Design an enzyme around this catalytic site. Structure first.
Site, PDB file in Angstrom:
ATOM      1  CG  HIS B  64     -31.459 -48.765  30.261  1.00  0.00           C
ATOM      2  ND1 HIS B  64     -32.313 -47.723  29.974  1.00  0.00           N
ATOM      3  CD2 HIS B  64     -31.781 -49.251  31.486  1.00  0.00           C
ATOM      4  CE1 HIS B  64     -33.110 -47.596  31.027  1.00  0.00           C
ATOM      5  NE2 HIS B  64     -32.817 -48.509  31.954  1.00  0.00           N
ATOM      6  N   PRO B 113     -31.127 -44.062  23.348  1.00  0.00           N
ATOM      7  CG  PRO B 113     -30.258 -42.989  21.488  1.00  0.00           C
ATOM      8  CD  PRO B 113     -30.899 -44.302  21.922  1.00  0.00           C
ATOM      9  CG  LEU B 114     -33.008 -42.736  28.415  1.00  0.00           C
ATOM     10  CD1 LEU B 114     -32.360 -42.153  29.659  1.00  0.00           C
ATOM     11  CD2 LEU B 114     -33.919 -43.897  28.796  1.00  0.00           C
ATOM     12  N   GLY B 154     -36.692 -42.191  32.904  1.00  0.00           N
ATOM     13  CA  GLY B 154     -35.852 -41.374  32.057  1.00  0.00           C
ATOM     14  C   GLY B 154     -36.551 -40.905  30.794  1.00  0.00           C
ATOM     15  CG  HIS B 259     -29.664 -48.108  36.158  1.00  0.00           C
ATOM     16  ND1 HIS B 259     -30.641 -47.991  35.201  1.00  0.00           N
ATOM     17  CD2 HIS B 259     -28.540 -47.595  35.603  1.00  0.00           C
ATOM     18  CE1 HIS B 259     -30.122 -47.435  34.120  1.00  0.00           C
ATOM     19  NE2 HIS B 259     -28.848 -47.183  34.336  1.00  0.00           N
ATOM     20  NE  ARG B 354     -40.836 -19.536   1.010  1.00  0.00           N
ATOM     21  CZ  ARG B 354     -41.646 -18.746   1.649  1.00  0.00           C
ATOM     22  NH1 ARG B 354     -42.271 -19.171   2.720  1.00  0.00           N
ATOM     23  NH2 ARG B 354     -41.773 -17.493   1.235  1.00  0.00           N
ATOM     24  CD  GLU B 413     -39.279 -27.428  16.203  1.00  0.00           C
ATOM     25  OE1 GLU B 413     -39.056 -27.721  17.414  1.00  0.00           O
ATOM     26  OE2 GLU B 413     -39.765 -26.331  15.820  1.00  0.00           O
ATOM     27  CG  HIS B 464     -37.629 -19.951   5.887  1.00  0.00           C
ATOM     28  ND1 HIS B 464     -38.571 -20.789   5.307  1.00  0.00           N
ATOM     29  CD2 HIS B 464     -38.185 -18.719   5.958  1.00  0.00           C
ATOM     30  CE1 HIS B 464     -39.644 -20.061   5.033  1.00  0.00           C
ATOM     31  NE2 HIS B 464     -39.434 -18.808   5.410  1.00  0.00           N
ATOM     32  CG  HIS B 476     -35.355 -17.544  13.175  1.00  0.00           C
ATOM     33  ND1 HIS B 476     -35.288 -17.071  14.469  1.00  0.00           N
ATOM     34  CD2 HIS B 476     -36.643 -17.903  12.961  1.00  0.00           C
ATOM     35  CE1 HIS B 476     -36.503 -17.168  14.998  1.00  0.00           C
ATOM     36  NE2 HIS B 476     -37.343 -17.657  14.106  1.00  0.00           N
TER      37      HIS B 476
HETATM   38  C1  8FL Z   1     -43.672 -21.996  14.830  1.00  0.00           C
HETATM   39  C2  8FL Z   1     -43.284 -20.552  15.085  1.00  0.00           C
HETATM   40  C3  8FL Z   1     -44.068 -19.628  15.671  1.00  0.00           C
HETATM   41  C4  8FL Z   1     -45.462 -19.751  16.150  1.00  0.00           C
HETATM   42  C5  8FL Z   1     -45.529 -19.590  17.638  1.00  0.00           C
HETATM   43  O1  8FL Z   1     -46.927 -19.638  18.032  1.00  0.00           O
HETATM   44  P1  8FL Z   1     -47.248 -18.939  19.436  1.00  0.00           P
HETATM   45  O2  8FL Z   1     -48.579 -19.377  19.814  1.00  0.00           O
HETATM   46  O3  8FL Z   1     -46.127 -19.177  20.341  1.00  0.00           O
HETATM   47  O4  8FL Z   1     -47.249 -17.396  19.032  1.00  0.00           O
HETATM   48  P2  8FL Z   1     -48.468 -16.389  18.714  1.00  0.00           P
HETATM   49  O5  8FL Z   1     -49.241 -17.071  17.530  1.00  0.00           O
HETATM   50  O6  8FL Z   1     -47.837 -15.199  18.154  1.00  0.00           O
HETATM   51  O7  8FL Z   1     -49.331 -16.326  19.885  1.00  0.00           O
HETATM   52  S1  8FL Z   1     -43.289 -18.091  15.792  1.00  0.00           S
HETATM   53  C6  8FL Z   1     -41.901 -18.685  14.901  1.00  0.00           C
HETATM   54  O8  8FL Z   1     -40.954 -18.667  15.857  1.00  0.00           O
HETATM   55  N1  8FL Z   1     -42.078 -20.069  14.692  1.00  0.00           N
HETATM   56  C7  8FL Z   1     -40.985 -20.900  14.162  1.00  0.00           C
HETATM   57  C8  8FL Z   1     -40.214 -21.628  15.202  1.00  0.00           C
HETATM   58  C9  8FL Z   1     -40.222 -22.995  15.214  1.00  0.00           C
HETATM   59  N2  8FL Z   1     -39.469 -23.700  16.114  1.00  0.00           N
HETATM   60  C10 8FL Z   1     -38.714 -23.061  17.029  1.00  0.00           C
HETATM   61  C11 8FL Z   1     -37.902 -23.868  17.933  1.00  0.00           C
HETATM   62  N3  8FL Z   1     -38.669 -21.734  17.096  1.00  0.00           N
HETATM   63  C12 8FL Z   1     -39.378 -20.994  16.183  1.00  0.00           C
HETATM   64  N4  8FL Z   1     -39.279 -19.687  16.242  1.00  0.00           N
HETATM   65  C1  8FL Z   2     -29.556 -41.288  32.309  1.00  0.00           C
HETATM   66  C2  8FL Z   2     -29.543 -42.704  31.763  1.00  0.00           C
HETATM   67  C3  8FL Z   2     -30.249 -43.735  32.261  1.00  0.00           C
HETATM   68  C4  8FL Z   2     -31.138 -43.778  33.443  1.00  0.00           C
HETATM   69  C5  8FL Z   2     -32.554 -44.046  33.033  1.00  0.00           C
HETATM   70  O1  8FL Z   2     -33.356 -44.157  34.241  1.00  0.00           O
HETATM   71  P1  8FL Z   2     -34.718 -44.979  34.062  1.00  0.00           P
HETATM   72  O2  8FL Z   2     -35.522 -44.695  35.237  1.00  0.00           O
HETATM   73  O3  8FL Z   2     -35.259 -44.698  32.734  1.00  0.00           O
HETATM   74  O4  8FL Z   2     -34.190 -46.483  34.082  1.00  0.00           O
HETATM   75  P2  8FL Z   2     -34.162 -47.577  35.267  1.00  0.00           P
HETATM   76  O5  8FL Z   2     -33.339 -46.891  36.414  1.00  0.00           O
HETATM   77  O6  8FL Z   2     -33.328 -48.660  34.761  1.00  0.00           O
HETATM   78  O7  8FL Z   2     -35.529 -47.801  35.718  1.00  0.00           O
HETATM   79  S1  8FL Z   2     -29.982 -45.196  31.379  1.00  0.00           S
HETATM   80  C6  8FL Z   2     -28.773 -44.414  30.379  1.00  0.00           C
HETATM   81  O8  8FL Z   2     -29.391 -44.408  29.184  1.00  0.00           O
HETATM   82  N1  8FL Z   2     -28.759 -43.042  30.707  1.00  0.00           N
HETATM   83  C7  8FL Z   2     -28.004 -42.077  29.892  1.00  0.00           C
HETATM   84  C8  8FL Z   2     -28.825 -41.353  28.888  1.00  0.00           C
HETATM   85  C9  8FL Z   2     -28.968 -39.997  28.987  1.00  0.00           C
HETATM   86  N2  8FL Z   2     -29.660 -39.287  28.042  1.00  0.00           N
HETATM   87  C10 8FL Z   2     -30.238 -39.914  26.998  1.00  0.00           C
HETATM   88  C11 8FL Z   2     -30.925 -39.097  26.003  1.00  0.00           C
HETATM   89  N3  8FL Z   2     -30.163 -41.232  26.844  1.00  0.00           N
HETATM   90  C12 8FL Z   2     -29.442 -41.971  27.749  1.00  0.00           C
HETATM   91  N4  8FL Z   2     -29.344 -43.264  27.547  1.00  0.00           N
END
Ligand code: 8FL
Ligand code: 8FL
Ligand code: CA
Ligand code: CA
Lengths: 675, 675
Positions: B64, B113-114, B154, B259, B354, B413, B464, B476
């Site tokens: 911004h 997008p912040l 932000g 701002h 896969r 991710e 998957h 999932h």
């Molecule tokens: C990576 C992953 C796992 C390992 C966790 O590793 P963690 O240390 O938390 O578990 P532990 O090894 O059993 O101690 S599980 C499976 O969910 N998955 C895929 C997975 C990936 N992303 C999201 C958002 N949810 C998920 N579910």
């Molecule tokens: C909340 C928000 C802002 C304040 C930033 O507050 P920050 O402290 O970063 O900026 P400053 O006040 O100028 O110093 S901007 C606008 O983007 N927005 C909406 C906004 C919300 N979510 C995402 C993902 N992107 C955005 N863009």
């Protein structure tokens, strides 16, 4: 000892469940059984009344470890049995591969997508603090419960948990007690490969209290003491570091291989003999373990019995609050609450639907105490705060109070979404909402999808819905967003066109008990429509302008309904008669009777949709679709609409082309199908 | 001084741009002008060659604030002028309301997008480290550039930045230097309302170095010294805390009102006079500022001139590496690289897509050095690592080297998605990929959408893909996910059915220069199809089984193509002749000629789609749609397919009903439209 036998029982139930399914996750259950035993012994709960409002809540954020949760629920005599454990991960069972609150008694929320459960726990704890501040009185601790969360390394890596943990620390949520399974193993192996941060130092930086348990494979005394310590720190959430061995006891303990696949049969045999169990037996439940757990249940039931008498005495001492509390625990909104919804006529001024939303909230918040909500740093843009309300903050800050109704989420959409799920999960009829720009609801998709799967009546106040926002440009202008959420099962996506439709959208959102809502609202002003009403808009789709001799029907939403009405007038000058349908919520419309739907979208007439975003989904309701399937632009909004031909003349041109395209053709409703 | 005059010039250009638009954000530009001046004076760049591979990169994560960036680019003589500044936020201008890399010379990435930009900076820095490790030699510092990022409160609240900052600290990315605009103001007011964490302590916990500049409103000497200090710390990314006043100089400085809206005219007048400018003049550029900035440009151009000679000498000393580097800087893949893609016949065994993906990667990674990639803690599930490669890690860890090719993203991710965008933005023909389960690509939607808007050729290896994953269950199993991304402009969403189609999907993904790819891949085995080839699948959609007297055509993707082929045989026994179309990528198909597309989806025959996820979008290609519009289930995958009637008989039943529904009707291709 009996405690040692209970821990072994839990471990072996979990391993045997995974073995029977030949699928699932034995490692974290083995590592966390001591902690689960210790935490459940501290918790107050009734297996025969899963909805007791003063229960402690437990959340398994590392939901893949659910064989552990299911084993606890079975041992404590919830409505889940050893026979259900034998059906772990089997189609139709009460023991799915990740816990689902709709299916599993004692599962407060739906976990499995990492990071969500800890954020849900923040929301349960936020709700408990707000609820206690609203109802507790001297000698009347109506609400004094804790929120216990287990989480692993994966949850700690997901950004959503950082957002919620920062906020929970800010909010001084002292009844939240989380436990990190510090086992140094994830799917890709050692956490040394990707996750070497100082977690404890990070949690201190958020304002959390820390307790470290260095031998959480055995030291239940220390785990219990950590809970006692956490309860003394009333102004900070606590993180308990549980240093465990993943798969403790297995030949494969301490390896990634034990995380996520069944143990070998010989490994299970040696586990059983090391712990005094019969290696020939599966799903063993020693009667002394049942006896010990039953004693705790009986004690908890006497606590709930006394709470019921406290509640009766509260209703005598505080008659109005007591009746309000009773109504909420019965799941009922105030009688005739909807009479507070604003109603408009076509003589009233044009208003942006974000401002109409502000006005609704201003009228209904004073009438419906179970409404609370907030915004992700967009309060003056989303218009989500009612004047004269106080923010939800710890009083120590001077910035609000826990009795407050308005939450400053900060720039944290994903955590806001998951916290909203936790507030809903708390119960007590909470009807909670969260504001951001529609395009940034997408940041929270992980949680939004879980609102739908979990059947929680949360509401997104999603303003600045389209290119109508203007100058901020294509990084801010939704294109795909409504299609994404409409394509998700069980999401009501309201895009109201005017004042009456906005009131209908809120009526739906607040009355909801099982369906999350997204309200797509405008930056820009829209006229009050001739023909709108709460009654008709409550049907999700309705005939706004009826034309018995229609050459075409234009179906539209939101800002494009007024555009369609203006196009109807252009078309009249071209000799074409149009009707107009407003479709403020596709899901609500779909749920109406077939005959009602056909009265809106009849056979025998071409139907054109108009909505300034993706055309996906629109063929359910139309033969031809006028939408926006490219990114937007940075400029004054009216100029963007003109650029893309979302003008009365542009709609009329496409309507005329649609009429011509169907000349000589037989046309049946888009609602018809072959199967 | 001239430096003071430059800072005032920057401030006033930004304020005047916002004033001319009557829209935008003056506060952070006013606060960050000293830092911008200081950083750009340290940076090496050529305004006349925005793609010099050894330039320092700058990223404005608080997008911004882009009036600041545009002012810098104008002052330094990029292809952006004062006349463009006068058109800030106006339709069609080169100065959109948030920076877009496709539109703005000198904008490395698209921000707004912040949280995204800092993560993009992590990716630029990751790429630079990998690139330098690959090419630098003694006396040949081919790559030695820095990555400078500005970010605000932000960005620090958004979880994606926590993910990327944890990872960057783990990766010891010493050429990353970020600057936090510590102004204690966001849209909802003071950061005291929502953001009270100790940011510095958190960044220390990630392994970052810290420099604090307590008077960043004036102290450019300290900002320059902070950069010098950061450059000495070669094994940690650095966060520079810039304590600033938002809107510095304005009557409204230090308030949320500064701002995000234009300043009052009288405020602008007093700014100008306080700083020695004419209050009657707008868009002033003092010639002494231009002279000073031009001196730095001229010096930088001599540095690039010497780099070009270094590169020529490198090509003589290291002939093979030099030719490889030249080819990459020319944007060309190796000649005939695609001959390494595996080819299959219908006699070959069934394979999960896969695993086919793993095999492709194993063949092409050794042939195409600009391929690097990783997984979000799903390496053994996504099958994304080629055997025999080394991980990208700092050598100090012993776990890899910066010359490595495989990235352990951890359970991150969203940051993985934004880091991939940064790797692409680095340039040098990087073709980079990231693995997770398809359902969790949704966690990264904020970044994925920006891949599309930014036109970056990144690839998601999204395994998957459906209920075919089985026991992990509905948390999932994708339903809405493909519809969401297909509805986003400029995303190729490949869902290959077999070995040849998987090779075609990778050919597209690696050859891409402007379109991100998502490869939706199966857990479960699929047969090699009669009629598939790389050649045909490269068209995005093709006739798999041609039937000149077809009663119906079944169009399908992925795992459902084999299902359609089996249904064709059931239908033959019912006296119904079907053709089959495979549609591995809808976007690629859409881009083919109208005549080619009509050869696949002709007039005069009913068309039924089959895909075990949402039916949204499918009416583009079909008259009737058989999909899955409800959540999944936890059980063995074949049992889930049977439950939902995704069986040869279930498809045949719906095909027969489709034939019956169109008896006596005239049917034209779904590709036809009225406009
Ligand atoms: C990576 C992953 C796992 C390992 C966790 O590793 P963690 O240390 O938390 O578990 P532990 O090894 O059993 O101690 S599980 C499976 O969910 N998955 C895929 C997975 C990936 N992303 C999201 C958002 N949810 C998920 N579910
Ligand atoms: C909340 C928000 C802002 C304040 C930033 O507050 P920050 O402290 O970063 O900026 P400053 O006040 O100028 O110093 S901007 C606008 O983007 N927005 C909406 C906004 C919300 N979510 C995402 C993902 N992107 C955005 N863009
Ligand atoms: Ca772990
Ligand atoms: Ca700020």
């Amino acid at each position: 000892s009996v405690d040692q036998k209970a821990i072994s029982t839990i471990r072996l139930l979990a391993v045997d469940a995974v073995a029977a399914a030949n699928s699932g996750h034995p490692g974290a259950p083995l590592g966390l059984a001591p902690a689960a035993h210790a935490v459940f012994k501290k918790m107050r709960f009734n297996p025969k009344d899963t909805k007791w409002i003063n229960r402690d809540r437990f959340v398994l954020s590392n939901g893949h470890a659910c064989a552990l949760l299911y084993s606890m629920l079975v041992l404590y005599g919830y409505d889940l049995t050893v026979e259900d454990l034998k059906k772990f991960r089997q189609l139709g069972s009460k023991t799915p591969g990740h816990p689902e609150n709709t299916d599993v008694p004692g599962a407060e929320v739906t976990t499995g997508p990492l990071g969500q459960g800890i954020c849900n726990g923040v929301g349960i704890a936020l709700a408990q603090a707000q609820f206690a501040a609203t109802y507790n009185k001297p000698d009347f601790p109506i609400s004094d419960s804790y929120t216990y969360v287990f989480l692993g390394d994966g949850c700690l890596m997901e950004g959503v948990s950082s957002e919620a943990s920062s906020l929970a620390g800010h909010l001084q949520l002292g009844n939240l007690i989380a436990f990190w399974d510090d086992n140094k193993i994830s799917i890709d192996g050692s956490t040394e490969v990707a996750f070497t941060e100082d977690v404890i130092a990070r949690y201190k930086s958020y304002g959390w209290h820390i307790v470290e348990v260095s031998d959480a494979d055995t030291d239940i005394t220390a785990i219990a003491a950590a809970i006692d310590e956490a309860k003394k720190v009333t102004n900070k959430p606590t993180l308990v570091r549980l240093t465990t061995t993943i798969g403790f006891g297995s030949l494969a303990q301490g390896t990634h291989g034990v995380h996520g696949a069944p143990l070998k049969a010989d490994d299970i045999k040696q586990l059983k003999t090391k712990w005094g169990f019969n290696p020939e037996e599966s799903f063993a439940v020693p009667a002394e373990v049942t006896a010990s757990y039953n004693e705790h249940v009986a004690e908890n039931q006497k606590i709930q019995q006394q709470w019921n008498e406290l509640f009766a005495a509260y209703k005598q001492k505080y008659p109005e609050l007591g009746a309000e509390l009773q109504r909420r625990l019965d799941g009922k909104l105030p009688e005739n609450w909807d009479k507070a919804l604003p109603v408009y006529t076509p003589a009233d001024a044009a208003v942006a639907t974000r401002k109409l939303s502000e006005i609704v909230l201003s009228k209904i918040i004073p009438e419906v105490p179970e409404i609370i909500g907030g915004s992700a740093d967009l309060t003056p843009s989303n218009l989500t705060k009612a004047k004269g309300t106080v923010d939800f903050q710890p009083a120590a800050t001077g910035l609000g109070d826990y009795s407050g109704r308005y939450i400053r989420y900060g720039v944290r959409e994903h955590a806001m979404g998951a916290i909203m799920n936790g507030i809903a999960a708390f119960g007590a009829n909470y009807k909670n909402y969260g504001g951001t720009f529609l395009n940034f609801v997408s940041y929270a998709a992980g949680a939004v999808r879980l609102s739908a799967l979990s059947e929680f009546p949360i509401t997104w106040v999603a303003t600045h819905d389209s290119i109508g926002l203007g100058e901020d440009g294509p990084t801010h202008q939704p294109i795909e967003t409504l299609a994404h959420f409409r394509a998700t099962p069980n999401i009501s996506v309201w895009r109201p066109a005017d004042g009456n439709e906005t009131s209908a959208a809120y009526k739906s959102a607040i009355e909801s008990t099982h369906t999350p809502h997204i309200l797509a609202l405008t930056r820009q002003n829209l006229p009050q429509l001739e023909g709108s009403s709460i009654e008709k808009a409550s049907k999700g789709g309705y005939t706004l302008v009826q034309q018995d001799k229609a050459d075409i029907i234009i179906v539209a939403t939101g800002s494009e309904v007024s555009l369609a009405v203006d196009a109807l007038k252009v078309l009249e000058g071209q000799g074409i008669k149009a009707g107009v349908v407003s479709l403020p919520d596709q899901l609500t419309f779909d749920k109406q009777s077939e005959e009602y739907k056909l009265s809106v979208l009849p056979d025998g007439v071409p139907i054109l949709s108009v909505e300034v975003m993706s055309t996906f989904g629109w063929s359910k309701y139309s033969h031809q679709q006028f939408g926006l399937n490219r990114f937007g632009a940075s400029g004054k909004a009216p100029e963007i609409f003109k650029l893309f031909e979302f003008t009365p003349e542009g709609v009329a041109e496409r309507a005329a082309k649609t009429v011509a395209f169907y000349k000589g053709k037989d046309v049946v409703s888009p609602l018809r199908s072959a199967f």
